[model samples]
Target chain A: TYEISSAEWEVMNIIWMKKYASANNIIEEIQMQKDWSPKTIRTLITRLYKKGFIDRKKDNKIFQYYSLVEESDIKYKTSKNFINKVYKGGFNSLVLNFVEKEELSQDEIEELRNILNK
Target chain B: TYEISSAEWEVMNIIWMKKYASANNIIEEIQMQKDWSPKTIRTLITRLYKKGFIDRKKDNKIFQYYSLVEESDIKYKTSKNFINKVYKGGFNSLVLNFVEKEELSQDEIEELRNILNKK
Candidate 1:
């Protein structure tokens, strides 16, 4: 039920972060980073509403969008789903691939070791 | 650029594994796992060709598709891209997130430790 597309996540991030956001609030935040039109950003908000991932309150003429889902849960599920698709459910290979390819600082390595030790 | 859609990777997997695949070969392989229409699968083939990720050879009336990109490189790039999008380019956090969430076998845990020890 928490099936959210990557594009939709951009819209969701704004709502989830702000707790409640108007259309303009979401658009402005996204515009700072992306070249997306206001219409395109609004479309993502509408899609999120339609999917029951968010609900809006009408404050006068303004619509304040609020998340219906938990950000933590969505992150966990989507990260797992991504691993399933990319690594065929091999979580270790994904970690190994990143560890092998990326330059890890000594601090990062020790922190990773501590995490593993836990 | 080795930018490939996740859907296109399915068709590419067939070609990569088989080294060369006909339209029928790709279609049949996908059909076993997916209920996609032959038309839909063929459309993916055309898109892959258009993107220059693949090329075709003619064997009589049959078309054989072969990969123009290396599979290993695509996997590495897409994997890195995924981490960038999901974890904001924090590779350590990505690994840490998985370690915290998933239940790993002892063998798998040890193997991961071994990999980390290498660096």
Candidate 2:
């Protein structure tokens, strides 16, 4: 379920955010962020459809694509898998690593501290 | 390099922890957690050596394999790349997700809070 690749994400995010989008809309949205050809974007859409992350329906003569899964659900699953792989299921180690190494502004650090406090 | 695959990590961790290990030592360590054959573990060791994570020298007639890089360095780089891909470089979002969704013990929570407090 969390199998979406980086290239696929570019195409999938468009449909997920738009809720319903045509092939043309997907290519247009992707073009703003990447230089992938329309043909390539179409291919990616087909892959997502095959992968069942997306489904297409006939909109008159055109097809409108929609997400079969929620964005939050995908993010959650991806995060879980990532933690399992990198930290061996140690979420605390991940947070500890971030605090010890990664740069976080005063406000950002405060925001994280507040979240933990609650 | 953080290109170490999941399979390669098994071999690499042995060298990193033991600081110096033989093919047999690696196979023994990995076998405790995995069912991979000795031949497969040897293949993994060769892959890591070619990839430059491990360099071997002779200890008498046998080979002693050792890590060329630190474990912490690889972990840091891997975590950075993972965040970029999944969160679009939003470290805050990663922390928020962990806090809101993932399970953490009260002791763990306090430990994290104490670190951020920096007092």
Candidate 3:
């Protein structure tokens, strides 16, 4: 699985949220907190499009964008990558580390147990 | 917020799981499945050590190793990176996308609601 850089994730999040959004929508979403210009958002959109993680279509003067990657796919891939990278491809070790560090809540523990049963 | 490659992540997962594992332990753990040689595991250990993600100490002829990075730190950093990369750093977008695609379970939705409440 390929890794997404922090900056790229920010842009992906917007596309993922809206399902389909225009450049204006993305800019509006992040401009307030990030103080980013419209051009910055456009650049991110272009980059994501080039990476094949998102698709863009021209709608008049604006472009509508949508995510090509599924959140679950990315999550599973990334999580697997994380475990493989850190724990030598050992799911048991990764789960143990998470359980130990997070002090798994009762619900989480139950959920994990159920998953293990499957 | 450096991204971990797939191969590197394999090495990291081993270290993360063992908390502290020797080269022999790591080799033993993966060799069966990966069919990798001891030299390969040792090489990965060396690379991780250079990356400052693992600390190694000489224990007689063998080396004892431990993760220098915390799992939570990597998780949060990677998650944030995912958001930034795909969603223009919009948490709302990331959550919405996740919700849409996964059909977030009631419990997960509630958990997210709680996180939003904190915000």
Candidate 4:
């Protein structure tokens, strides 16, 4: 599976939220956070389309784009990849590592215990 | 930083666990789980070394390899990337999505609420 680049994910994040938006909408949203030119956003849009992560529909010479991939799908794939890569596919080790290192609050610790119990 | 590939991670996982192991040891462990020949594992080790994710020390004509990058570091970067890509960097939305869609048992729900209430 191809990993998404950091810049690509920024674009995907907007598409995920909007569900369906026009190119201009995406351009506008990105412009809010970045100094990227319109041409750069356009290039990203085209790349996303080519990568099969987004769909485009032409409406009166304007393209309405929507995310074709689900966020859950990517999360599952990426999480699995992480487990396989770092934890040697050991779920137990992964959980233990998180519990040990992360600054979990009392509530968070309780929650983890509950998760393990279930 | 360049992201580690899936194949490269597999090798790193072994080195992380063993701390310091020879190429032969890694190849042997991989052989147990995969059909990859010794050459394939060797190639992965070489690539990892070149990527600076692993360091090598020569001991008695044998090179012992160790992971240079911490697993936590990679996890943090990957999680951040996921949030940026899928959740618009919204931590709340990411947690909410997981709670809604994941097959979390009743216990898990309680846990999430507890996490929210922490002060």
Candidate 5:
């Protein structure tokens, strides 16, 4: 029953790559793209730490963050739940929909082929 | 961001299939499974109608409901946003992950193979 929202994962993703990041580190990565001040982002990260998704040690004003969960775990759990809700466990339809609509390169298709080799 | 939560979507799914459903019809489908009474389910449906997901008309205490949004539309938009947030716009990674696991049977894989046959 460990679930994290996609929005939470956005903040968590930063921590996963950066084993020890302060609020500034995460915000700096998305600076031009976002208006999130250091404090705002820091607070957000702090909230995530409280949620038990990330771990951090504060040194005076520093919030050094690392992930408690892995990306694969997050993706698998969330995606599986979504399939149950949307398709009632119809994963095939989802994969088919992506196959038809999404622009897939030949290499990706080949790799996808290998993956589907069950 | 016209969005509905997964919980809301559970309610929405019924109306979409029913075309013109009373709360009874919805609850009847999920009756034994849910502890929710008709009143509670009706109240939930009433809220969804106000949120613009479903269209309903009242015939003196009867609420006949129809979906305003298609299932495909919901799936596409929600899945796209999820990919953006989760994978940072990497849809391929998600597909690959599913392909590796999820017990997709031989029939599913053969079908999946045809789907991925890009020239």
Candidate 6:
């Protein structure tokens, strides 16, 4: 269930980070980082709820929205979609390219090695 | 400087592989692989050309198109765009996730290790 656009990804990020948030809370958090109109934020939240990327629950008289999709699932789905677009679904080449070109330090590579070892 | 949609990617792939190709050659190659109408393929070619994903030179009044966008540049740009979308620019998490979840063989992991060790 992919409902995220560039506009929606930020809203979803807030929801995912907060676990649950009212539209007002989401607007407040994003506004601390970037200036967006209250309407813009509320509209995005409304769209996400309708699209089922987020769901609403009654918290007293107000509704709190939470992500229907997990961060890991979103990451996996988006990564796979990216592979299809750029590599024509031949992902090994992509993995190899990043391994060769990404600027990982000795510390970073050692961390990656430990991660791979796990 | 990126000009690609899913429709244009395969077209670019052909030109990149061929170095250059006439419109007829591109149509023939893809048509053999998939049942796209010639018009659909030609329109995508026109779009890519106007968008500068590819360029053309005349040979006896026929045009041979070649990719202006390097496959590597496309790969890098597209990869970065994807990383931003999914991870909010936290790319380390992406690398870690793919490494853990991707079913690389022992040889693949060793190759990655060797590549990493160069750092």
TM score of chain A per candidate: 0.85, 0.90, 0.78, 0.82, 0.77, 0.87
Q: Evaluated with DockQ, which candidate comes out highest?
A: 2
Q: What is candidate 5's lDDT per residue for A21-83, written digit by digit as tens? A: 877778897565677677777777767778777887787787677787766766777788877
Worst-scoring 10-residue span by lDDT in model 1 chain B? B83-92
Better of 4 and 6 by DockQ: 6
Q: Which residue ranges in model 4 land beyond 4 Å of their true spot?
A: A89-92, A107-118, B1-3, B31-44, B47-61, B68-119
Question: Which structure is stronger by DockQ: 2 or 5?
Answer: 2
The residue pairs in collision within model 1 are none
Top candidate when judged by lDDT against the true structure: 1
Calculate model 3's interface RMSD in Å. Answer: 9.3
Model 3 Cα displacement at A2 (Å)? 3.9
lDDT value for model 5: 0.72
Tens digits of per-residue lDDT for model 2 on A7-108? 887776677679999999888988897889999989999999899899988888899999998776677678777766667427767767666776778877
Q: Which residue pairs show collisions in model 5?
A: none
Q: What is the per-residue lDDT of model 1 for residues B8-88, given as tens digits with 9 covering 90 to 100?
A: 878887787888899999999989978999999999999999989999998788888999996656677877767666565
- Every model's Cα RMSD, please? 3.4, 2.6, 8.0, 4.9, 3.6, 2.8
> For residues B7-114, what per-residue lDDT tens digits would candidate 4 score against the true structure?
777788788789999999999888887899888889999998888889999889999999889787775565555555555534444444444456766765565444
Q: Tell me the tens digit of each residue's lDDT in model 4 across A1-118.
A: 6677767888887888888888899999999989999999999989989989889888778899998888777765665555566665343344444444556777656654443344
Give the per-prediction TM-score of chain B: 0.82, 0.82, 0.67, 0.71, 0.78, 0.80
Model 6 off-target regions past 4 Å?
A1-3, A99-101, B28-36, B58-62
DockQ for every model, please. Answer: 0.41, 0.52, 0.16, 0.24, 0.50, 0.42
Query: Which structure among the candidates has the greatest TM-score?
Result: 2
Candidate 3 regions with alpha-carbon error over 4 angstroms: A111-118, B1-119
Candidate 2 residue-pair clash tally: 0
Per-chain TM-score of candidate 5, chain B: 0.78
How are the candidates ranked when ordered by DockQ, highest leading? 2, 5, 6, 1, 4, 3
List the global CA lDDT of all models. Answer: 0.80, 0.79, 0.65, 0.72, 0.72, 0.78
Candidate 3, residue B118: the lDDT equals 32
Winner by TM-score between candidate 2 and candidate 1: 2
Q: Using Cα atoms with residue i matched to residue i, what is each candidate's TM-score against the true structure? A: 0.77, 0.85, 0.54, 0.69, 0.79, 0.84
User: Residue A74 in candidate 6 has what lDDT?
Assistant: 71
Give one digit per residue, the lDDT tens place, for model 2 in B1-119: 44777778667656767899999988888899889988888898998888888899899999999988877668778878777676763777777766777677888778787778772
